[PDB]
Design a protein around this ligand. Structure first.
Ligand SMILES: CC(C)(O)CN1C(=O)[C@H](F)C[C@H]1C(=O)N1CC[C@@]2(S(=O)(=O)c3ccc(F)cc3)c3ccc(C(F)(C(F)(F)F)C(F)(F)F)cc3CC[C@@H]12
Length: 253
């Protein structure tokens, strides 16, 4: 199945689907690099309440996930799978896709991320009280920066990150396995054509993405235990759905 032109068609279809669904153009993020939060501004974020910062972040993470749900809906063959499989893949892989995606909004020269209109270092998120999770995130973005990814590579890689046939709870495991193989051929083929297979060995292990997601849910349980009515009243429904319905309505569209 899938000949060389069908694989080359898949590549362009995945790359188009990601351009249509990335929250901000790479050019937009790159042009902002010199707009860094002032010392005073960082202190403002630091002085903010924990539950306020946590609301802000859950909100931003939900917007990011919403674009990943649209990227999945535009992925070739994803809408063909059953809703159970669609929701299983999105539940496990949505945070994961964002964790890879975020490298575009990171600056390895000054070690800063683009948050709320400006760039800022780790200390911006001090009030969250995650520390190990924030460092883990910042190291993960630093590690993907060393790869000097192209948009096409980030699109092909994230499609694979999402289309994982090993996710527990999949009903048609073979149907995921068929598409995951096709997407893998497209990724490797593109790498091969562009003389970029070198990156394959440097890519993060699957267990790195799993640890970051675990750290996320673990730190969320802790916060929720201290502030249950903040998570109840001020957290977005889709956030509580994936990390604590909406996905079915989001898929219908
Ligand atoms: C500018 C733009 C589009 O928002 C940048 N982005 C992209 O390009 C990505 F695809 C998605 C988006 C993006 O970077 N992101 C979407 C929200 C944001 S962020 O920008 O708010 C942020 C960046 C770095 C960082 F250390 C902390 C927060 C976010 C929010 C919360 C968490 C947490 F895991 C936390 F770290 F706080 F513990 C959670 F959920 F538990 F709260 C993690 C992340 C990492 C991805 C980040």
């Amino acid at each position: 199945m899938a000949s060389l032109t069908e694989i080359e068609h898949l590549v362009q279809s995945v790359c188009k689907s990601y351009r249509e669904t990335c929250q901000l153009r790479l050019e937009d993020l790159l042009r902002q690099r010199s707009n860094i939060f002032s010392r005073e501004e960082v202190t403002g974020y630091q002085r903010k309440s924990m539950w306020e910062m946590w609301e802000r972040c859950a909100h931003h993470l939900t917007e990011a996930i919403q674009y990943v749900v649209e990227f999945a809906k535009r992925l070739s063959g994803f809408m063909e799978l059953c809703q159970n499989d669609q929701i299983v893949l999105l539940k496990a892989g949505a945070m994961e896709v964002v964790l890879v995606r975020m490298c575009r909004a990171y600056n390895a020269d000054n070690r800063t991320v683009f948050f709320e209109g400006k760039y800022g270092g780790m200390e911006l998120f001090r009030a969250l009280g995650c520390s190990e999770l924030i460092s883990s995130i910042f190291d993960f973005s630093h590690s993907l920066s060393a790869l000097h990814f192209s948009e096409d590579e980030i699109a092909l890689y994230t499609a694979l990150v999402l289309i994982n046939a090993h996710r527990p709870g999949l009903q048609e495991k073979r149907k995921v396995e068929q598409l995951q193989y096709n997407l893998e051929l497209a990724f490797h083929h593109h790498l091969c054509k562009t003389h970029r297979q070198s990156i394959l060995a440097k890519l993060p292990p699957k267990g790195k993405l799993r640890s970051l997601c675990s750290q996320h849910v673990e730190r969320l349980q802790i916060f929720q235990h201290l502030h249950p009515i903040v998570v109840q009243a001020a957290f977005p429904p889709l956030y509580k759905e994936l990390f604590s319905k909406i996905l079915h309505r989001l898929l219908q569209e």
